Design a protein around this motif. Sequence first.
Motif, short mmCIF file in Angstrom:
data_model
loop_
_atom_site.label_atom_id
_atom_site.label_comp_id
_atom_site.label_asym_id
_atom_site.label_seq_id
_atom_site.Cartn_x
_atom_site.Cartn_y
_atom_site.Cartn_z
N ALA A 93 34.19 47.77 22.38
CA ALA A 93 33.84 46.47 21.81
C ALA A 93 33.94 45.38 22.87
CB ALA A 93 34.74 46.16 20.62
N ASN A 94 33.16 45.55 23.93
CA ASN A 94 33.28 44.70 25.10
C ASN A 94 31.98 44.79 25.90
OD1 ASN A 94 34.16 44.68 28.28
ND2 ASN A 94 35.31 43.16 27.09
N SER A 95 31.74 43.75 26.70
CA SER A 95 30.57 43.67 27.56
C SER A 95 31.02 43.33 28.97
CB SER A 95 29.58 42.62 27.06
OG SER A 95 29.94 41.33 27.51
N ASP A 96 30.15 43.62 29.94
CA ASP A 96 30.48 43.36 31.34
C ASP A 96 30.70 41.88 31.61
OD1 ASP A 96 30.53 45.87 32.92
OD2 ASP A 96 28.50 46.11 32.11
N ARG A 97 30.07 41.01 30.82
CA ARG A 97 30.20 39.57 30.99
C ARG A 97 31.32 38.97 30.14
NH1 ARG A 97 26.10 36.31 32.09
NH2 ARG A 97 26.22 35.46 29.98
N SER A 98 32.10 39.80 29.46
CA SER A 98 33.17 39.34 28.57
C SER A 98 34.46 40.09 28.88
CB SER A 98 32.77 39.52 27.11
OG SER A 98 32.57 40.88 26.79
N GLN A 99 34.83 40.14 30.15
CA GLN A 99 36.06 40.77 30.61
C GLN A 99 36.95 39.74 31.28
OE1 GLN A 99 34.77 44.03 33.09
NE2 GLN A 99 33.96 45.21 31.36
N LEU A 100 38.23 40.08 31.41
CA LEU A 100 39.22 39.10 31.86
C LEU A 100 38.92 38.59 33.26
CD1 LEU A 100 42.62 40.64 30.68
CD2 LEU A 100 41.22 38.90 29.51
N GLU A 101 38.48 39.47 34.16
CA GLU A 101 38.20 39.03 35.52
C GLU A 101 36.93 38.20 35.61
OE1 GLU A 101 39.68 43.05 36.67
OE2 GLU A 101 39.32 42.26 38.69
N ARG A 102 36.13 38.13 34.55
CA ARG A 102 34.97 37.24 34.45
C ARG A 102 33.99 37.60 35.57
NH1 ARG A 102 39.28 33.66 32.54
NH2 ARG A 102 39.11 33.71 30.26
N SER A 103 33.63 36.67 36.46
CA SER A 103 32.61 36.93 37.47
C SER A 103 33.15 37.60 38.73
CB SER A 103 31.92 35.62 37.85
OG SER A 103 31.16 35.11 36.78
N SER A 104 34.47 37.70 38.88
CA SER A 104 35.04 38.19 40.13
C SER A 104 34.73 39.66 40.33
CB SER A 104 36.55 37.97 40.14
OG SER A 104 36.87 36.59 40.02
N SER A 105 34.52 40.04 41.59
CA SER A 105 34.39 41.45 41.93
C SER A 105 35.68 42.19 41.60
CB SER A 105 34.07 41.61 43.42
OG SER A 105 33.96 42.97 43.76
N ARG A 106 35.54 43.32 40.90
CA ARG A 106 36.71 44.10 40.51
C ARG A 106 37.21 44.99 41.65
NH1 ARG A 106 34.46 40.77 36.89
NH2 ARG A 106 34.48 41.61 34.77
N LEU A 107 36.31 45.39 42.55
CA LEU A 107 36.59 46.45 43.52
C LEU A 107 36.45 46.00 44.97
CD1 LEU A 107 34.66 49.28 41.69
CD2 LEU A 107 37.04 48.58 41.39
N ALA A 108 36.28 44.71 45.23
CA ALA A 108 36.14 44.25 46.60
C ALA A 108 37.36 44.63 47.43
CB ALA A 108 35.92 42.73 46.63
N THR A 109 38.56 44.39 46.89
CA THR A 109 39.78 44.77 47.60
C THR A 109 39.95 46.28 47.63
OG1 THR A 109 40.86 42.69 47.01
CG2 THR A 109 42.28 44.53 47.66
N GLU A 110 39.73 46.95 46.50
CA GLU A 110 39.93 48.39 46.45
C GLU A 110 39.01 49.11 47.43
OE1 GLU A 110 40.22 50.65 42.79
OE2 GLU A 110 41.13 48.95 41.75
N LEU A 111 37.75 48.69 47.51
CA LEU A 111 36.81 49.33 48.42
C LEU A 111 37.16 49.04 49.87
CD1 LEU A 111 33.59 48.53 46.38
CD2 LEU A 111 34.59 50.79 46.70
N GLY A 112 37.53 47.79 50.18
CA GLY A 112 37.84 47.44 51.56
C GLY A 112 39.04 48.19 52.10
N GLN A 113 40.09 48.31 51.30
CA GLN A 113 41.31 48.99 51.71
C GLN A 113 41.33 50.46 51.32
OE1 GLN A 113 44.77 47.16 52.76
NE2 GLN A 113 43.06 46.20 53.85
#
Lengths: 75, 172, 172, 172, 172, 162, 162, 162, 216
Positions: free
Chosen positions: I174-194
């Motif tokens: 019951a959720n959409s990609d545009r209705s999540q807590l992190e909002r517009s922020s990249s979720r994986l920018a840090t995870e992918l970089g490190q």
Amino acid sequence: RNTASPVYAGSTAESLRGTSAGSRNQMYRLQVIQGAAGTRVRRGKAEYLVSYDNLSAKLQQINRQGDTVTMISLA
Amino acid sequence: MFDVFTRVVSQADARGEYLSGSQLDALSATVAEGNKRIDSVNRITGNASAIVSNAARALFAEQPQLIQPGGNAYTSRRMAACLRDMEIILRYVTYATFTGDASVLEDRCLNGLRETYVALGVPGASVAAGVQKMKEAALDIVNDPNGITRGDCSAIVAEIAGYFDRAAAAVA
Amino acid sequence: MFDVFTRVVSQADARGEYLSGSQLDALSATVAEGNKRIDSVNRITGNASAIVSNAARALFAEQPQLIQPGGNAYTSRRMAACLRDMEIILRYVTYATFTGDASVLEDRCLNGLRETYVALGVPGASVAAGVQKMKEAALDIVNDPNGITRGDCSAIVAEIAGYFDRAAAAVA
Amino acid sequence: MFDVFTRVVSQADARGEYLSGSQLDALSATVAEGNKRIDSVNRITGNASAIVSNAARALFAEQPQLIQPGGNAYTSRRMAACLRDMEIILRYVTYATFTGDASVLEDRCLNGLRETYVALGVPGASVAAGVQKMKEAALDIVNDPNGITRGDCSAIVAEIAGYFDRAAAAVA
Amino acid sequence: MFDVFTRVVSQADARGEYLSGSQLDALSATVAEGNKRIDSVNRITGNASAIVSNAARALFAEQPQLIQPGGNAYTSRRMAACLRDMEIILRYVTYATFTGDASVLEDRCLNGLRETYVALGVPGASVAAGVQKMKEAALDIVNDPNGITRGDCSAIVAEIAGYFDRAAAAVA
Amino acid sequence: MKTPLTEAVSTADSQGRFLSSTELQIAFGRLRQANAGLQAAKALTDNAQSLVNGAAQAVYNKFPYTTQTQGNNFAADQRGKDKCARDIGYYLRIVTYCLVAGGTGPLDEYLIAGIDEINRTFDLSPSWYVEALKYIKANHGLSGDARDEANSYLDYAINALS
Amino acid sequence: MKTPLTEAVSTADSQGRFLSSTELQIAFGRLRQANAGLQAAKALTDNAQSLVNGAAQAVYNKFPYTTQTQGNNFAADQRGKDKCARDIGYYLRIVTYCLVAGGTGPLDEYLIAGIDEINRTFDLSPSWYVEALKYIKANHGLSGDARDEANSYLDYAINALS
Amino acid sequence: MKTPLTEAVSTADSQGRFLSSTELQIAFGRLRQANAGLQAAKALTDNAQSLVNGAAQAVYNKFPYTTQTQGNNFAADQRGKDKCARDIGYYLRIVTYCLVAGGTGPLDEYLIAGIDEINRTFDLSPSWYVEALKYIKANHGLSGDARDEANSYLDYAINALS
Amino acid sequence: AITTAASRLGVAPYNESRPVELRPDFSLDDAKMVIRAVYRQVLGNDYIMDSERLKGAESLLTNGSISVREFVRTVAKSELYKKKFLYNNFQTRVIELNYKHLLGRAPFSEDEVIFHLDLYENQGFDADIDSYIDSVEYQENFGENIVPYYRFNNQVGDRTVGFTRMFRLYRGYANSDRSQLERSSSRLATELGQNTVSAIVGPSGSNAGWAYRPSR
Ligand SMILES: *[C@@H](C)[C@H]1/C(=C/c2[nH]c(/C=C3N=C(/C=C4\NC(=O)C(CC)=C4C)C(C)=C\3CCC(=O)O)c(CCC(=O)O)c2C)NC(=O)[C@@H]1C
Ligand SMILES: *[C@@H](C)[C@H]1/C(=C/c2[nH]c(/C=C3N=C(/C=C4\NC(=O)C(CC)=C4C)C(C)=C\3CCC(=O)O)c(CCC(=O)O)c2C)NC(=O)[C@@H]1C
Ligand SMILES: *[C@@H](C)[C@H]1/C(=C/c2[nH]c(/C=C3N=C(/C=C4\NC(=O)C(CC)=C4C)C(C)=C\3CCC(=O)O)c(CCC(=O)O)c2C)NC(=O)[C@@H]1C
Ligand SMILES: *[C@H](C)[C@H]1/C(=C/c2[nH]c(/C=C3N=C(/C=C4\NC(=O)C(CC)=C4C)C(C)=C\3CCC(=O)O)c(CCC(=O)O)c2C)NC(=O)[C@@H]1C
Ligand SMILES: *[C@H](C)[C@H]1/C(=C/c2[nH]c(/C=C3N=C(/C=C4\NC(=O)C(CC)=C4C)C(C)=C\3CCC(=O)O)c(CCC(=O)O)c2C)NC(=O)[C@@H]1C
Ligand SMILES: *[C@H](C)[C@H]1/C(=C/c2[nH]c(/C=C3N=C(/C=C4\NC(=O)C(CC)=C4C)C(C)=C\3CCC(=O)O)c(CCC(=O)O)c2C)NC(=O)[C@@H]1C
Ligand SMILES: *[C@H](C)[C@H]1/C(=C/c2[nH]c(/C=C3N=C(/C=C4\NC(=O)C(CC)=C4C)C(C)=C\3CCC(=O)O)c(CCC(=O)O)c2C)NC(=O)[C@@H]1C
Ligand SMILES: *[C@H](C)[C@H]1/C(=C/c2[nH]c(/C=C3N=C(/C=C4\NC(=O)C(CC)=C4C)C(C)=C\3CCC(=O)O)c(CCC(=O)O)c2C)NC(=O)[C@@H]1C
Ligand SMILES: *[C@H](C)[C@H]1/C(=C/c2[nH]c(/C=C3N=C(/C=C4\NC(=O)C(CC)=C4C)C(C)=C\3CCC(=O)O)c(CCC(=O)O)c2C)NC(=O)[C@@H]1C
Ligand SMILES: *[C@H](C)[C@H]1/C(=C/c2[nH]c(/C=C3N=C(/C=C4\NC(=O)C(CC)=C4C)C(C)=C\3CCC(=O)O)c(CCC(=O)O)c2C)NC(=O)[C@@H]1C
Ligand SMILES: *[C@H](C)[C@H]1/C(=C/c2[nH]c(/C=C3N=C(/C=C4\NC(=O)C(CC)=C4C)C(C)=C\3CCC(=O)O)c(CCC(=O)O)c2C)NC(=O)[C@@H]1C
Ligand SMILES: *[C@H](C)[C@H]1/C(=C/c2[nH]c(/C=C3N=C(/C=C4\NC(=O)C(CC)=C4C)C(C)=C\3CCC(=O)O)c(CCC(=O)O)c2C)NC(=O)[C@@H]1C
Ligand SMILES: *[C@H](C)[C@H]1/C(=C/c2[nH]c(/C=C3N=C(/C=C4\NC(=O)C(CC)=C4C)C(C)=C\3CCC(=O)O)c(CCC(=O)O)c2C)NC(=O)[C@@H]1C
């Protein structure tokens, strides 16, 4: 093999473009013979309509699967 | 797809007509045959693996050229595809029996099948022979009078035989 | 797709020539008609719903067989598709009017439309009659002298008529 | 997703036990109430549009801040999304009533919903109020003594009230 | 994204108010600066390659540790990424200048850039140094009095400098 | 078309599965229902003209402007009245198909899909047909399972319009 | 091609929308520009041979090795000089198309897309063509909007080559 | 939202390109239009009370059952009248936003998206609002470019309702 | 597979679903299911308004003029998609969304960000979209005729980091990609970089600590 083929003479080759025919607004009809060597294959003979921009990618896809191209024409 | 009921509805709508009393009575007769229909589906399904494997063994026994090296059923992949095709056809025959309309069998299984086999070199006549063997075993299973309320299933058996016959004709 | 300008460019490029003075002068004349072209696009767009609905009503009034049960425009889905088609053709005609070139209409809308209708059983002659009705209504709206700076719009009206006629011919 | 039957089965399998006689009898009592369950689902579904619209009207009347400019239900898009939410919650409540288990509500409707409203700024307390209004209307509809075989539906009504309460608690 | 006009509109709608006379006058003032804004965008774009390359060459000269072996701009892949980033930032600066609102720069370019550079070890302070170098070059290009209608571009220049400052601050 | 038998097979087909006890139970449910649907279809069919004319007059009584106001979308003339009686006849007839089929498939495929575009395009008010459907519910005279199924389709149409 | 009118219609079609005031304003912007663009095209066309010949000599002057070094990619012989004058003519002619079309579309479609592969494959220096484009900018003698639009396309080619 | 400046940057951003003469032409089109749009917004705003009240009364005259019929969707009581005048005011206000923004964006985002679901759910006839919009068209007193752009948004809303 | 934690993790509804395939000679209902499935998947379960529907693309899909994949490509290149996911996002966020929508999985490595960022910057958004749909991965999982779906279960060619990152991008049914807590922020920018991962936090409703998010 005592079979027939679809008729694509005159204007019967044409297919609708809309906004799905890429930058050149051209559709290409690829008739292929395919088998299961991936997703399930439902028909041994298939037709694909792809834009010019994706025509190269589609040929490699058909090529990678080992399927045979019987005819290509502008749609 | 259509079932036995929606087939009549579609024809009536195209004519802008209510179903006649006769048509309603014909569907009531179909309802009366429902339990026999359900039993036939259940009996074929319960014996599906035996029906396919026995027919395939009998098919390859009578047509050894299929399984000799270079034969179209030779190598594990082609044998597996062959046994799969038999199971597919039997499955869609049961679907048609369940719905009481051939549309599911024709549209989803038989349409394009001869062209597929001719394109890929599958001998359609051999497929037809395999379907006939499945037909014989399936009808015998349906007609078995043991362990079931006795009654006349000739109409259902005739209908099932027609679906097998269409399948055999479609591939050959 | 081409507009009125790039159509001349593409023809010049294939010949490896600069545009002649006559060709540049012709485009200058087209620029002088630009305001009339924009008004015609605005007027047709501002009346799009009325043009489609009024033409559709007239079409069904003159061709009652389309909407009778079994008719090709019978049932809500088919009627909705039919009205959608009329709006699509009108929309692409306004696109061609905006660009000043039939390429957008021909390349995106009309190419293969006849084959789509022939396969579906959509009566092409009836579509052309519908497009014709939209044409006469559209040209009257474009030609309305009220509430606009007065001038001669016969050239653009002739061009718009040609685009409508192309659509009718493509589907008939 | 579980139904009333598979909920018990899953608990039994995790223990590696056959269902006891008491458990089978309890499920038999559930089957005896099946007609009441189907009626309640039918009645809520048959009045779904009225339940949503009436509850929405009541919510906005008591909470005019939701629909004034800047409110979370202001503008057609947000307002339409709000009405969709009420319909969706009601739809899943009917699913839970149909299956006799809250899992479909928990697994799908309420799974991530609080994150959605917190992220978007939707006032969860106001959604809970709207769900409460739908509950009141739905239970009255289920309990209507007219045009139905009379009997005691208190148990099914209590179960349905719980599903509404679950949804209201999950959002606020 | 918002442009200068839609930013005011969005604020007004949330308050449910018509734009005040002062707000309309302020936007009218923005319109009077439009030609200068367009010229500034055109001038930066026409020198985009030189601005990026000259800034990059200057940056590596003052900061040779970026391009030594093991340095963050060392290897063709990383150097290409570095030049690409400078071009991306300049591109979105010109976008913000064009629209008159920083939202496109914030949303597309700067939101998350610091997190990216921190995760990868890209020295954000050195990126900011490069951005400042592009700023001095770009503003000099915008202010060139030759080949243009003379007038006061200080307000436009100040706005552009702000977007560069915002880009530098976002990464440093 | 949504009917118990078609959905049973389609779900099994999507799973690449033979039919099992689940699908047979679906068939038994249809068989328990089918005769009531056929009798309901017969009763509505025999009474169709009285129901359609009564429904149309119920609409005209509830919305008198439809018979007083000039316009292509209104019933101030016999042309409009004939269109209106025709439309109400379509609703009733397709409802009998749902009773025959055992599901909303006939309503979905023939009537509901695209109805919003039609009413918007031709300036037809959904409330008119809601009133017509409510009259049919109040006057078809069915009882028991026939009543329950018939009303489910009439309410299904009303909900689609609302 | 990338021109204001085709792009406006392309974006509208992607949304299935009729053209609106936004697209009408795009047309008005095109109309404001077109006469200056057409005048720029005429001036460049009338001066094409002087510009092309002058540009070729400017490249030879700035890069003298191109006229003294044997090789297929150089202009030490009449063959290479003719290829060079032809190429510079292509740039100027297609730039006039951009002025006529009011956008970079002709440059993109005919020249820029794939220029990197050509220059790498045939060992042609982009710097040579940058110098030729700089000469044309400095010598076309345009003013006002004609100058601005023409220089935008000439700079667009220069940026693509750098 | 759809405005000339936003569309221009959206196109270039989608292509990963700097703004070119095409986008600059779009901006020039905006500048040619903007002052007339701001004038139209001011004129409608100053006259908003008169237009909204007259528009509501025009609807009541054309559809007299709306002020005579009991129901939550009608204006028979002061509650429904206040709702109706509110709604017409929303149309007029959001139209002024379109004039300020230079596109249908505000109408698309704030009013039209989902309007079909609202009118269906609350049993509101789109014909009522079409009549109100026609009144505003015939009574805003604008002229020239202000009239043309203003009527484009009013007709845009009318077409969305029909 | 995922059995015990399926409901807790929001995976149970997808365990209970099957791929949506458009068979040859498809019926009317088949086409509608594909359109619904494509809109839910490709647009990240955002509500789609009638004015936002791609009626032309839907028509061509219904007519057989475009296959499922070409319909997916048309939706992914539409202004509706770009408005929802491109114009207001960091391109790394765009790349995250493209992988979830078009390939039903999370990015595995920084190399994927490098590839698609460069492809967008050099050839544009439409070229980048083609890369997902014409990929070997798309071909092997969905082919011409199957709507994309979330690939929660382990497959050949998987990496374990993909599993944990799926629940960074997927936040419940019951959720959409545009209705999540992190909002517009990249979720994986840090995870992918490190090349790091984070403990899986399940969706709200079934997990009290659903809202845990680390700070900068
Ligand atoms: C021809 C097919 C053979 C045959 C069949 C036959 N069956 C019945 C009656 C019933 N069969 C069932 C079936 C099931 N009940 C279950 O719970 C399950 C599992 C889902 C099944 C498959 C039922 C419910 C009935 C009705 C009650 C009864 O047992 O009688 C009949 C009798 C006529 C009828 O239509 O009911 C017949 C004839 N009988 C034969 O002799 C054929 C070999
Ligand atoms: C509380 C829910 C209310 C209530 C219900 C109730 N219903 C029955 C019995 C039946 N209801 C049905 C339902 C249907 N028949 C159909 O054909 C369909 C349409 C598809 C439906 C929904 C049926 C089949 C029965 C059994 C036969 C009968 O008509 O009685 C009861 C009686 C007890 C029982 O469980 O059978 C009850 C209590 N009654 C109330 O007073 C509540 C307001
Ligand atoms: C600061 C930015 C510098 C500056 C700018 C400036 N420009 C104008 C006026 C105009 N500039 C243009 C621009 C173009 N015309 C075209 O055809 C194109 C190519 C697509 C462009 C970019 C136009 C149309 C005008 C208006 C008409 C004119 O020719 O003047 C001004 C004058 C004030 C005004 O706003 O019009 C100014 C100040 N001037 C400087 O001195 C700064 C270095
Ligand atoms: C030997 C170790 C034991 C044994 C063998 C046995 N096999 C079969 C039947 C088949 N064997 C195969 C295998 C293959 N076919 C191929 O094409 C290939 C790949 C190149 C292989 C490995 C197949 C497909 C069959 C079935 C069809 C056929 O008969 O050809 C049988 C007969 C089974 C039956 O039901 O007829 C037997 C007896 N049996 C033993 O007891 C041995 C220890
Ligand atoms: C077995 C009795 C005979 C036999 C069969 C055989 N068939 C194939 C290949 C295919 N069969 C089909 C048919 C279907 N696929 C479907 O999905 C359905 C509908 C649900 C049907 C009816 C298809 C499409 C193929 C090609 C793709 C695939 O293989 O999956 C083969 C293999 C052919 C090859 O060389 O690859 C075989 C062996 N062959 C015999 O000799 C028997 C007479
Ligand atoms: C109305 C005046 C006539 C009519 C129309 C009608 N058309 C269809 C179906 C289709 N129409 C199209 C056309 C297009 N789709 C597009 O996207 C575009 C732009 C590129 C066009 C021109 C298509 C593709 C279809 C098929 C798929 C679809 O249903 O949308 C129908 C329905 C046919 C059916 O049997 O389903 C109808 C009714 N019919 C008449 O009788 C009028 C003369
Ligand atoms: C109405 C009473 C209240 C209200 C609601 C509101 N909700 C949203 C947005 C969304 N609602 C959901 C919920 C679901 N989607 C599903 O698929 C499911 C079932 C599995 C549920 C329960 C979602 C996911 C969204 C976001 C997606 C989307 O496209 O909106 C909004 C819109 C918010 C916005 O900014 O657009 C609104 C308004 N708001 C109120 O004020 C009422 C209290
Ligand atoms: C030598 C054959 C000719 C020459 C060289 C020259 N190169 C540069 C500048 C750079 N060279 C590189 C190349 C690399 N950097 C790497 O990391 C690698 C891969 C491991 C390579 C191959 C780069 C990136 C630059 C630019 C940044 C830097 O300065 O390090 C220059 C100076 C260019 C300038 O504008 O500063 C020169 C002079 N020049 C000749 O004339 C020789 C024929
Ligand atoms: C150059 C002045 C400095 C520098 C840069 C540098 N950046 C990267 C890597 C990336 N840059 C980005 C940036 C963006 N992505 C976006 O979506 C946006 C807006 C559209 C921006 C600006 C990203 C996401 C990456 C990661 C992917 C990639 O590698 O391209 C590198 C490479 C780092 C590495 O390979 O580990 C470099 C070198 N480095 C310096 O030293 C300069 C100060
Ligand atoms: C009756 C309650 C009121 C009424 C009716 C009315 N309807 C129309 C026109 C149409 N009605 C339909 C509806 C259908 N067509 C179908 O195929 C089906 C599905 C099986 C339905 C439900 C359609 C499509 C039309 C438009 C095309 C046609 O004329 O057939 C009119 C005329 C509208 C016009 O502008 O011509 C009228 C009068 N009007 C009232 O006032 C009644 C209260
Ligand atoms: C006036 C022409 C007629 C009329 C109006 C009327 N409207 C409602 C209720 C609502 N109106 C809207 C519309 C909007 N809300 C928005 O946010 C916007 C976009 C910015 C619009 C256009 C909505 C959403 C509602 C429902 C929620 C609310 O009440 O605010 C009513 C009351 C309906 C009810 O059942 O409560 C009325 C009376 N009615 C007439 O008869 C007039 C001719
Ligand atoms: C042709 C079918 C009819 C016609 C047209 C016509 N228009 C003009 C002049 C103008 N029309 C416009 C249009 C608009 N201004 C805006 O702001 C917008 C809204 C976005 C639009 C659509 C403009 C700008 C002009 C120029 C200024 C002026 O009003 O004169 C003319 C006059 C000649 C010219 O081309 O400019 C004409 C002829 N006139 C008719 O009589 C036909 C019915
Ligand atoms: C066996 C010794 C123990 C055990 C294992 C177990 N694992 C799972 C489920 C998964 N395992 C993985 C792991 C991987 N996926 C990959 O792609 C790779 C790297 C290439 C690894 C290592 C994943 C991702 C899952 C979940 C997804 C899937 O299973 O497809 C299970 C099932 C969990 C469940 O059903 O809920 C089990 C049982 N369990 C034990 O008790 C042993 C100690």
